[model samples]
Target: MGHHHHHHSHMNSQRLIHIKTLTTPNENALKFLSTDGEMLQTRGSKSIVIKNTDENLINHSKLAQQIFLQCPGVESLMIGDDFLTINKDRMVHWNSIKPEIIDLLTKQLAYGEDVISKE
Candidate 1:
């Protein structure tokens, strides 16, 4: 009984994250969904659009920055409430980049990292 209780407590503390990749109308773009809620704290924040070279992106959004860092082929990013859509170079393929993006986001959410690094 004690062992069962311990396992239950451990499961409660560690949340499993859900992530899925979807193909967009644009061949170069992909949409990712995360179970963790609300990327932005404030209501009605403007959507952030970035293309790799912005330091302020890291300050404004940790997820976006991590996506750019983990997935090098990323050419553009749009961050919304719970979904992030990325457009990458034509040469890059989702089969290669999706797993890395998934892994980073999973770690970030499971560990309860803030969505925006600047905050």
Candidate 2:
């Protein structure tokens, strides 16, 4: 048999869309997970990845705008259903930013608000 290498993808469309907290390796980055369904849905030919500082993050989910406008040290993030990956500045500690991320997610979902505008 020929030698071959297979790489598993991080993307999980089956993951529940609901959001929650998680820990990551980068001291400035935070993560989240879900057990329900895919948070980001597709529309014909596109998807969304909400990041604070990256313009190329593509779509501007209302949910992301609210956070990006407020994060003092945010650098980048990967927003997925039931999961999120937040990368921040080197100077700012996750301790200060973590609470806000959690609070926002909880508030929005708890209050039954849209994560992002109609996409």
Candidate 3:
């Protein structure tokens, strides 16, 4: 028997992009690298819905990707121009991942490193 993984597309390119930024320094924001309510729309939009049950209004795809790649617990991450979504295969203990993610972002931000990498 073979196993297959199905992926659902959560993005619509034709629709207007929305921006979502985090306001509080909570687990989602800290683990996801979201600025304090600093979400900015591209040009026009009402709201940015990040798909995640708990969403952040910032585009932290690059950072998220890096963490997802390095961390064993991260399952998947989806990044669009306006929103970011993360799918965890197992229960994630935020406390365990928070510090690691923060440290990674801090280092990247300090060096002005480009988190977005083109394959």
Candidate 4:
């Protein structure tokens, strides 16, 4: 084969992410559904709950850190196969936080990298 420069790898660039928000029983928490496919490939389909970045099992994952960083007032997060539940401060509004989270995950999926770098 002829020498070729490395091109950015996209899992399915054409398949855009379509996220839908759902209200949970807790008024302070909200759930985001990824209609495309699984968000994170967790260990044995178990959910990972991350309340703190400094000390958590899923801290190695970019999603956990980014959520805490970009989305202010985010107290904790829970990740399932195709959904994410975030617990934020009562004072914060979901309107301000939704777009950023969706943008972050969409970019992450486009990169096609494992959610957790080191579990």
Candidate 5:
């Protein structure tokens, strides 16, 4: 008897991006990179820094807005072309914030959404 196989490869357009978490010199700051070595932005070597206090500017990046709102511990963040750094409340353990960040990144990458808003 032959077994039947289902082919649903068309849905594979969704990216298989993975977030790689890394530690930073500052205990409160954690680094995250794309496990697939993909570029998060297409620009120069300079990175954009966004503090929690910058409410108006934060709207420019959907990912940043989500992190600040969904992960209460995030105090500030720096966005690199291929990675990002999150500075959180020193009193809060990274365990509480890491999962939320990973989830948000995975969802954003899978949808192939641009991290920043158009100018």
Candidate 6:
């Protein structure tokens, strides 16, 4: 008897946005960074490996904006080729902010002009 194994691609449902570029290069060429539940950086110059045990908040937009406002020095962000770097003082409440984030990103993608810097 032969058995078949199935694999599902998370990229299909998960959305990826190039927030900003970093100053350094990374091994994987991409890094994801966040404050609590909100996204601070999606790709960066330093590696921020998110563990499976880490909690992923559902509404990302609200969380992202909340963290951006609450966290001091949480100004400009960059997602480098391999890592994400940000002020550690930032905090995020992922559970309450993910949906908003997704919705915001979706809206941005639909009508957002070219803001991402291109090389």
Clashing pairs in 3: 20-57, 20-58, 21-57, 22-37
**What TM-score, to 2 decimals, does candidate 1 have?**
0.70
Q: What's the distance in Å from true for residue 20, model 5?
A: 0.6
How well is each residue in 1-119 modelled by candidate 1, as lDDT tens digits?
A: 36654422123544556677777788887878776532332345555676677767655766677777777888888766566788899888888789888877776665543456433
Candidate 2: the clashing residue pairs are 15-37, 16-36, 16-37, 17-37, 39-81
Instruction: Write model 5 residue lDDT over 1-119, tens digit each, in one string.
Output: 88897743124554556689888778788889876634456566567888889986588878889998988888898887778899988888887788888888887766544466642
Model 4, CA-based lDDT: 0.74
lDDT of 1: 0.67
Q: What is the Cα-based lDDT of residue 77 in candidate 5?
A: 87
Model 2 worst lDDT run, 10 consecutive residues: 38-47
**What's each prediction's TM-score?**
0.70, 0.58, 0.38, 0.76, 0.78, 0.27
User: Model 6, range 14-114, lDDT digits (tens) per residue?
Assistant: 35443432333632222232322223333443423322222232122333344344443333333333324333323543333334434443444333322
Candidate 3 lDDT over 1-114, as tens digits, reads 878978543333333222233334433332243342222122243323333333242235346545665665655444333333344544676556556655555544443323
Best by lDDT: 5
Q: For model 1, where is the 10-residue window of minimal lDDT?
A: 5-14
Global CA lDDT of candidate 2, please?
A: 0.57
Q: Write the per-residue lDDT of candidate 4 for residues 1-119, one digit (tens) a residue.
A: 89987855445537566667788788898988776654555446666787865556545767878888888799888777667888899999988888998888777776654566645
Query: Using TM-score as the measure, which candidate wins?
Result: 5
Worst 10 residues of 4 by lDDT: 35-44
Give residue 83's error in model 1 in angstroms.
0.1
Higher-lDDT candidate among 2 and 4? 4
Residue 8, model 4: lDDT of 54
Assess each prediction's global lDDT (C-alpha) against the native: 0.67, 0.57, 0.42, 0.74, 0.76, 0.34
